[PDB]
Amino acid sequence: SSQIRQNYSTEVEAAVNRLVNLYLRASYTYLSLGFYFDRDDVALEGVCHFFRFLAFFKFFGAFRLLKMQNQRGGRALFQDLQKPSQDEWGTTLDAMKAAIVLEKSLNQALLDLHALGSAQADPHLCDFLESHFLDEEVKLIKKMGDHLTNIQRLVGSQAGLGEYLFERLTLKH
Amino acid sequence: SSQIRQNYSTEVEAAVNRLVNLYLRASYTYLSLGFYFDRDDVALEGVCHFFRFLAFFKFFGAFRLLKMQNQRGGRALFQDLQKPSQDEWGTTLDAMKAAIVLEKSLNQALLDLHALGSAQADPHLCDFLESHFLDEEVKLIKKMGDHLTNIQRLVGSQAGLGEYLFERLTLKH
Amino acid sequence: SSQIRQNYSTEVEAAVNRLVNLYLRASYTYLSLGFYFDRDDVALEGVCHFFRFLAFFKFFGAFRLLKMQNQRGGRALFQDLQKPSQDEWGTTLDAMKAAIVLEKSLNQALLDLHALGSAQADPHLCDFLESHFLDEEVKLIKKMGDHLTNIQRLVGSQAGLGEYLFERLTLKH
Amino acid sequence: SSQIRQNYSTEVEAAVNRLVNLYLRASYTYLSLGFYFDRDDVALEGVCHFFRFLAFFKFFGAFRLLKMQNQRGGRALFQDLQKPSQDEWGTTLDAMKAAIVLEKSLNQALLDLHALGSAQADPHLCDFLESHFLDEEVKLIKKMGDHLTNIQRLVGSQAGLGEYLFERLTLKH
Amino acid sequence: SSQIRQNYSTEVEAAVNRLVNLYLRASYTYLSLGFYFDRDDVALEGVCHFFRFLAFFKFFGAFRLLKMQNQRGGRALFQDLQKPSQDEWGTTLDAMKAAIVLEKSLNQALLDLHALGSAQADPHLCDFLESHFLDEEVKLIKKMGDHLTNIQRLVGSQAGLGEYLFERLTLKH
Amino acid sequence: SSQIRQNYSTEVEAAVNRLVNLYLRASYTYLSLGFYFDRDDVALEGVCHFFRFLAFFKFFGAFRLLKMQNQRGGRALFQDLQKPSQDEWGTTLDAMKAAIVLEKSLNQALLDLHALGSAQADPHLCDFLESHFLDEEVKLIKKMGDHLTNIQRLVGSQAGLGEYLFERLTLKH
């Protein structure tokens, strides 16, 4: 089979491939989010930049997973990448809500894979997730929650004003 | 006639002179826009600076056209320059709407001249427009559209507040 | 419809979206190629790096296309991204042959889009492709052809030796 | 009326607008002079540069006038800008003669406006002209007179030689 | 046939080879011009340097054409290079007239090749000429026209004096 | 005749012109060699660079000869330049064999011209060849012989491998 593979279950190997798919889909979703906010009829540069950065971060999560798959002697297998769930993403609030839903799903997939690794007595896998993914994910979700709260505080009765101010004064542009 | 002129039609020569007129008129329109926003009873420095910069950019478009006319062996001919269409330019929104109308007209004149050059098998003319004008124009129109959207989002029911905030937080001052 | 869109046909808009799909698929194909050559049982670092670089270049081609779609006032629409055509890519020769087939297909799609733009009298589109895509593509295809020739010269009767030497002495590692 | 305007007559306000028109026309005349000397069949780079510089200086005179109009609480009003008096400008001598005629007319307009300001007991206006215009104008006219004398000395019986030498050895290129 | 060639007609391939011949002949003509002006009985260093520089520029035009021929998968084919049309080149005026005739012929060959590329729907070829040749050629022809005018102005009745002065005060030495 | 010419025979003058022709032909031969090795179906960059460098060196030999012809008061006369002897140059071995044949012919022409100068008691000519040509030529021929030997050692029974290795490990790329 493999000359390096050791303590690396078929179940973990397949789950890692699934997780790569999920990260690449997330990157794709963020690519779509970023270009939507770049539209001339949306035009929220800070929001564009926030999601563009996340497209790159999620790609690099996939890349790290694939590197690890090879380091362990598993075989990368790629599947079709589903398009994002929407073509238009509504307001900054709508978009940030969709982003936290996405991130919570990615987090649950990380937790599930960690639990599989623990069941399989695969400490390298468990350490890998802990060291490179689980805290990054908690930090990201906390940032999105912070943003959601600030966006919600700004809606009030002048929604356009609040959306502009959030983009200008919170997000980097 | 001319010792350098080669593959440069009378039709293109005249159209280039017309286009110089249009760019100089545009520069004049932007000069008027800039000084209107500098009025003590208007007083939107960022808006002033935005249109002042465009007066200079449109002059330099004219200048480049005239340089090219001479490089090709055509003869610059100047006409009367019509004053701008308004003496007072209303709100930032009104002004940005008038600017995008102006830019779309300049863009259509560029496209028309490109089509004439293509019909006349004048690739130097076509390349010149492509390289120095067509993308600059698309970029400018996209920026104005972005601005229009942000200004429109800010009107809401507190128009003065939105006009101040746009000037302060989007435009450079 | 759109406040900026001008001289930008629905046919071009759709074709640009199709081309984005093709570039993202190409990026995905190169991602798979790169990780295959990173396998412990393949282990050709220079080949890995060559295809990894191309995954990034093709993503950035897609990104530029999407930026232009927005600059013109079109609407990015994303579709499902087909997985790559193979899970395992054979020898360096096999892989470089598959890469040139891919690149020739991307080149033909560029040429087709250029021809559509010309038919539609869309010089901005034509210039955009000429300036950012057509020469990059010719340069890439020429490099791949050079590589193919060198790989073919090295097969002889000691194929493993030739594959090692090409990776070590031509490709960057 | 105006919240800042003080000691600023309607007569001065209108005269300042007229003077802006005259400076912009002068800039236009110099633009035409500059491009005439850039013709391949004229080809006197130093002369081109001399008049090009004056086109920019006269624009900036207009700009300063418009800035002052706003500082005083007057209202900029723009009129049609007459094309220059000639399409072709003859020899360097002809051109320098036309330039000094133009400058003397601008100087007389400055003097007239100064006299109006003095009659109206408008010392800010009087100081403004004295500080930014009257000496600049005297210096420019003296330079042109110097040039005229040197050009006239060079005509003799070898006019082409003299025109070349003046361009090469006096004017900056 | 070729593993890289795509959208590159036999007609364009042959025309590119012809154009290489024309550029190399032009380089040869300029080599002869340069050494004629270096003769002890001609001795016009600035003129020598002007034509020497053009010999190098025309060689590099040929070189770029040959590089492109290979990038496209065509085959460079070289023919005999005709000697220049004269052994002695007369006055600076005669020489500059012969140079502009040469350049106009090269320009017409560029335009002809561009038209062939357009007819063949070869945008890479069209872009290549536009980007590297057509404007360089217009700029060169305009410079030569400028020079011709200055040389003609200097003939007058003291031709030797004018030829010396042009060499000393216009051309770089 | 000439105001500087002294001790410079018609026989030497003509022979120098012949030698210029031979150097320019050699430059042309090397230009063809260089672009052949740049072909996508040849693709030996080090070989390309070796012959390209020689095209430039042989041009500069011609240039020095023409400079000397003028320094002595002779008259440069150019003839038609024959195309190179082949359109395709075979293997690196074939090409290096053709290069040493060419160089030996150029060397014999140098020796013949030296012998003519000696017979004519023209020490300046003799010194010129000795100082700028004869040792450069011996050094070049020795380098080519070294290369030939190394290429021959590498043929063995795996000719493609040897051709690759020579290009990669001996020639500069």
Ligand SMILES: CCN(CC)c1ccc2nc3c4ccccc4c(=O)cc-3oc2c1
């Ligand atoms: C599989 C197809 N997909 C998902 C849409 C890819 C493929 C490659 C990508 N490569 C990058 C990338 C590469 C280098 C530097 C920065 C970035 C980046 O910010 C985002 C990326 O996103 C990608 C998505």
Ligand SMILES: CCN(CC)c1ccc2nc3c4ccccc4c(=O)cc-3oc2c1
């Ligand atoms: C009103 C139409 N007209 C008169 C023909 C203008 C408008 C704008 C101009 N802007 C410049 C300018 C702007 C920035 C930097 C340098 C220059 C310059 O050297 C000359 C100018 O000349 C102008 C004439």
Ligand SMILES: CCN(CC)c1ccc2nc3c4ccccc4c(=O)cc-3oc2c1
């Ligand atoms: C007479 C037509 N032929 C022979 C094919 C020429 C003419 C001019 C050339 N000029 C150069 C040259 C010029 C400047 C810097 C580098 C180079 C060079 O590497 C090779 C050259 O090769 C030439 C051949």
Ligand SMILES: [Cl-]
């Ligand atoms: Cl499938």
Ligand SMILES: [Cl-]
């Ligand atoms: Cl009129």
Ligand SMILES: [Cl-]
């Ligand atoms: Cl779907």
Ligand SMILES: [Cl-]
């Ligand atoms: Cl009117």
Ligand SMILES: [Cl-]
């Ligand atoms: Cl022949």
Ligand SMILES: [Cl-]
């Ligand atoms: Cl002949």
